[PDB]
Write a protein that holds these residues in place. Structure first.
Motif, PDB file in Angstrom:
ATOM      1  N   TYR A 287       0.811  -1.156  -0.177  1.00 37.14           N
ATOM      2  CA  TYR A 287      -0.178   0.132   0.206  1.00 37.14           C
ATOM      3  C   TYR A 287       1.457   1.592   0.042  1.00 37.14           C
ATOM      4  O   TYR A 287       1.383   1.749   1.295  1.00 37.14           O
ATOM      5  CB  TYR A 287      -0.988   0.001   1.670  1.00 37.14           C
ATOM      6  N   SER A 288       0.641   1.854  -1.113  1.00 38.85           N
ATOM      7  CA  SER A 288       1.786   3.378  -1.001  1.00 38.85           C
ATOM      8  C   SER A 288       0.919   4.539  -0.294  1.00 38.85           C
ATOM      9  O   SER A 288       0.235   3.663   0.296  1.00 38.85           O
ATOM     10  CB  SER A 288       1.782   4.139  -2.679  1.00 38.85           C
ATOM     11  N   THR A 289       1.535   4.989   0.256  1.00 31.86           N
ATOM     12  CA  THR A 289       1.315   6.103   0.991  1.00 31.86           C
ATOM     13  C   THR A 289      -0.411   7.179   0.650  1.00 31.86           C
ATOM     14  O   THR A 289       0.776   7.496  -0.501  1.00 31.86           O
ATOM     15  CB  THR A 289       2.268   7.395   1.270  1.00 31.86           C
TER      16      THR A 289
ATOM     17  N   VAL B 291      -1.621  10.166  -0.910  1.00 33.79           N
ATOM     18  CA  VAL B 291      -0.651  11.236  -0.531  1.00 33.79           C
ATOM     19  C   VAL B 291      -2.212  12.777  -0.983  1.00 33.79           C
ATOM     20  O   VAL B 291      -2.803  12.409  -1.675  1.00 33.79           O
ATOM     21  CB  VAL B 291       0.415  11.881  -1.119  1.00 33.79           C
TER      22      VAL B 291
ATOM     23  N   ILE C 284       5.302  12.270  -5.001  1.00 26.93           N
ATOM     24  CA  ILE C 284       6.115  11.498  -4.207  1.00 26.93           C
ATOM     25  C   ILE C 284       6.489  10.625  -4.882  1.00 26.93           C
ATOM     26  O   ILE C 284       6.120  10.127  -6.369  1.00 26.93           O
ATOM     27  CB  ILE C 284       4.599  10.599  -3.137  1.00 26.93           C
TER      28      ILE C 284
ATOM     29  N   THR D 122       6.901   6.747  -6.110  1.00 28.74           N
ATOM     30  CA  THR D 122       5.762   5.322  -5.176  1.00 28.74           C
ATOM     31  C   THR D 122       6.439   4.377  -5.027  1.00 28.74           C
ATOM     32  O   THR D 122       7.904   3.697  -5.892  1.00 28.74           O
ATOM     33  CB  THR D 122       4.258   4.920  -5.391  1.00 28.74           C
ATOM     34  N   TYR D 123       6.365   2.714  -4.614  1.00 27.41           N
ATOM     35  CA  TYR D 123       6.938   1.408  -4.943  1.00 27.41           C
ATOM     36  C   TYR D 123       6.098   1.128  -6.319  1.00 27.41           C
ATOM     37  O   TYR D 123       5.649   1.856  -7.200  1.00 27.41           O
ATOM     38  CB  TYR D 123       5.795   0.461  -4.010  1.00 27.41           C
TER      39      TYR D 123
ATOM     40  N   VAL E  84       8.921  15.936  -0.067  1.00 29.40           N
ATOM     41  CA  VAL E  84       9.015  15.014  -1.408  1.00 29.40           C
ATOM     42  C   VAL E  84       9.313  13.262  -0.359  1.00 29.40           C
ATOM     43  O   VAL E  84       9.316  13.328   0.501  1.00 29.40           O
ATOM     44  CB  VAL E  84      10.260  14.785  -2.127  1.00 29.40           C
ATOM     45  N   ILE E  85       8.729  12.579  -1.033  1.00 25.38           N
ATOM     46  CA  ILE E  85       8.944  11.088   0.204  1.00 25.38           C
ATOM     47  C   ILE E  85       9.469   9.922  -0.965  1.00 25.38           C
ATOM     48  O   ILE E  85       8.604   9.928  -2.120  1.00 25.38           O
ATOM     49  CB  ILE E  85       6.844  10.423  -0.039  1.00 25.38           C
ATOM     50  N   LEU E  86      10.072   8.943  -0.654  1.00 22.09           N
ATOM     51  CA  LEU E  86      10.736   7.995  -1.869  1.00 22.09           C
ATOM     52  C   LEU E  86      10.365   6.897  -1.242  1.00 22.09           C
ATOM     53  O   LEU E  86      10.479   6.881   0.293  1.00 22.09           O
ATOM     54  CB  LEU E  86      12.483   7.839  -1.603  1.00 22.09           C
ATOM     55  N   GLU E  87       9.939   6.063  -1.751  1.00 17.36           N
ATOM     56  CA  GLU E  87       9.192   4.671  -0.967  1.00 17.36           C
ATOM     57  C   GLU E  87      10.242   3.704  -1.732  1.00 17.36           C
ATOM     58  O   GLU E  87      10.599   3.692  -2.588  1.00 17.36           O
ATOM     59  CB  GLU E  87       7.791   4.175  -1.427  1.00 17.36           C
ATOM     60  N   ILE E  88      10.767   2.976  -0.764  1.00 17.48           N
ATOM     61  CA  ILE E  88      11.851   1.532  -0.596  1.00 17.48           C
ATOM     62  C   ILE E  88      10.964   0.513  -1.347  1.00 17.48           C
ATOM     63  O   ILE E  88      10.541  -0.102  -0.077  1.00 17.48           O
ATOM     64  CB  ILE E  88      12.790   2.183  -0.528  1.00 17.48           C
ATOM     65  N   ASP E  89      11.152  -0.233  -2.078  1.00 18.47           N
ATOM     66  CA  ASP E  89      10.138  -1.393  -2.309  1.00 18.47           C
ATOM     67  C   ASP E  89      11.692  -2.380  -0.808  1.00 18.47           C
ATOM     68  O   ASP E  89      12.561  -2.190  -0.488  1.00 18.47           O
ATOM     69  CB  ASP E  89      10.593  -2.691  -3.730  1.00 18.47           C
TER      70      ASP E  89
ATOM     71  N   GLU F 107      15.354  -3.274  -2.400  1.00 15.36           N
ATOM     72  CA  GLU F 107      15.364  -2.156  -3.641  1.00 15.36           C
ATOM     73  C   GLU F 107      16.406  -0.818  -2.570  1.00 15.36           C
ATOM     74  O   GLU F 107      16.718  -0.821  -1.306  1.00 15.36           O
ATOM     75  CB  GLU F 107      14.037  -1.061  -3.338  1.00 15.36           C
TER      76      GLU F 107
ATOM     77  N   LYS G 255      14.534   4.560  -9.582  1.00 11.02           N
ATOM     78  CA  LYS G 255      13.454   5.628  -9.019  1.00 11.02           C
ATOM     79  C   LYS G 255      14.623   6.794  -8.167  1.00 11.02           C
ATOM     80  O   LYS G 255      15.992   6.437  -7.701  1.00 11.02           O
ATOM     81  CB  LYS G 255      12.775   4.925  -7.673  1.00 11.02           C
TER      82      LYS G 255
END
Lengths: 136, 137, 132, 133, 134, 137, 138
Positions: free
Chosen positions: D5-7, D9, D106, D108-109, E59-64, E67, E95
């Protein structure tokens, strides 16, 4: 027969030449004033310099070719017509060597490719006409 | 056939031609005055004959020599569409990074079939009215 | 593929794979006006729409050549029209027809097998059809 | 779950939602997303949300075997926030760009795009993507 | 311990910290600094925040899970009165994020699985270091 | 054994030949005032000696260190042609992406043979009159 | 040795330094827009908490390059003024992992150094970095 003749491009004038039995060095002389090739020299795998044309131009370039090194890209610039002249040569080798001689403001031939074996054409003051020759 | 026929693009006019026997040399003549192709010449493997068509009155030309094993991988013809049409430009790119550009492209375009360039076909008078390429299979 | 553009014009469906497709468009209206298609082993030109535009483009597709990238520009809504096509092939071939000043679809990809839509004066609506 | 689940925004406002094709509606006048639609593998239903009042839309069709490899959402941050843009890029070089990115982002994943989730009224208040594992 | 500590860059000021699946950075056009950072961890729903999120951007970075970070640069003002001004990161999946500004000093950090952060902040992020696996 | 590149530039200055039966360091001195090479130095594998030639009066220098196993894959010498000629520049690129640029290239160029850089040869006085590289086989 | 010594480039002046031990894990360069020289260098080593500094860090810029344990230098250039009077003016380094730094200026002379595992530095420094050489391993 066992050689490939590229189309000689440029004019009908100057004095004929044919240099063959491969190339290990080639030099081009050209002028900013006339924007033509004026003179070419070739050495073979044979200590003699085979020259032609009048080396009156203010620039030259030399490409040395390793024994196993082929030409993979080649362009000659020229003025077309009986009154025509060769104006430029770009060559690129199988080893990422390249030269650029003179100008490309009018006509172009993208030649055949392979082991550069000789040249052929007519030259006076200027290089009137030039063709390359490859193996098979 | 044994051949792939690109759609001939440009006008209905000029005198028809077909050149076949693969292509080893092709030349295109064009003008800055008219911004058209005017004349084409072709040579073939194992045949010393120069097959020309059209009037070579243009101030520019380009020649592409094709190695025996060298295919066309990218090809675009520029043309004016309609009965009164003309072919205005050719870009070709080979399997060895060789490429030519003749003349102009500011109206219509065809991105042709690709392969071993075997012949051409079309109509020509003063100008190249119409051009189609022909490939092997 | 989702047919994009308006509800108007006369329906078409062309199928039998596609070997040639042509798009006509205008600088005056900034729409597609007319499409033509040829098929493998069939010499027929299947046209639709009024070819009144000042430009056209033709993409020839080799037998073994798939579409890997495809974008249709369109005006959305009942009174909508299809305005542009970009296609790119598995052999680096690409065409660009007309304009992309409003809406876009990036379509499914594969062997281009047919088209389908509605056309009058303009191409009201277009969708592509792909394979296995 | 067996999902990532991505945050989500953007803002707290609008009405909650949780859901092979996705479409984005947006406006040059408000520079926001207004409306999203999604269609599913082996299910012919349009799951919509938000008010499609914007002058632009884009549709991305996703082949069965095609994953999302790059994804950015633009948004205004805060309770009063809104989601403003989406860039997506696929494992086949397909990409869409919807709306604007003038404030927050963002990255995302990534993976097989399985659903979306968020809140929408007039505008898309808030958006998060959902992927497989 | 079983952690790799990047040099914390920026000033001595603010309050010390020590805390990955998500990271966010807040910054201002007015001050051209980072002001606030948040982090989330795998299998833990907590927001670990620090600094005052008064900046007009984030800014947000999501990390698998699998990853890693393969390229990483932090911008900062050097000296006791220093501040951390920016972060660029690029992942093993292409990314990347860019936060804030880079118009003074830079560190190109170690690379790996981003495991934590550490550094002192008040109104601004005074000082920041990343922490990796070993 | 060795491959001799054509020595380019003038007939003037005092002859030199450096070889050791390969090059591990080479340095080029040049001037903005004269736009020539003025001086070259070379060190060899397992030999601490500096083999210099020419007058190092120029305001710039560059040094290229060559790893034992590192070959030259690209090489260009700029020069003024003619009896009263001079060498004006050297560009070299290695099998490990290392490259130097020394001096100027405003007149003539040779794209040389390539390989393991084994020595140099030429004539130098105030200026480097003439330079040729020497490679293995 | 077990070590490859790059030519030290720059002047004879300043106070000599030699930093060696594992290999380099961090290096920092200070430089000025006013003087267009390096002024100060710091180095840390694997399994050793010591900050080895030299020179006066008076310059308005710095950069730090962290080097992973297994990460080699694949490209390296030092800018310098030549002569006894000379100074080291810049460093570009590029790593086996696509990392690079650029410190200071390259308006005069250059050395393209040997490459490998960066193990130490050596040189002279006062107000400015007078002279710098890198040290690598086989």
């Amino acid at each position: 027969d066992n050689y490939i003749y590229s189309t000689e491009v440029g004019g009908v004038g100057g004095t004929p030449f044919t240099f063959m039995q491969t190339i290990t060095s080639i030099k081009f002389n050209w002028s900013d004033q006339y924007k033509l090739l004026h003179h070419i020299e070739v050495k073979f795998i044979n200590a003699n310099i085979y020259a032609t044309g009048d080396p009156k131009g203010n620039h030259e370039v030399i490409l040395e070719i390793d024994d196993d090194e082929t030409i993979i890209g080649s362009v000659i610039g020229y003025k077309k017509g009986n009154d025509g002249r060769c104006t430029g040569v770009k060559l690129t080798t199988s080893k990422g060597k390249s030269i650029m001689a003179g100008y490309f403001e009018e006509s172009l031939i993208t030649t055949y490719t392979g082991k550069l074996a000789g040249i052929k054409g007519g030259a006076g003051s200027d290089i009137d006409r030039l063709g390359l020759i490859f193996l098979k």
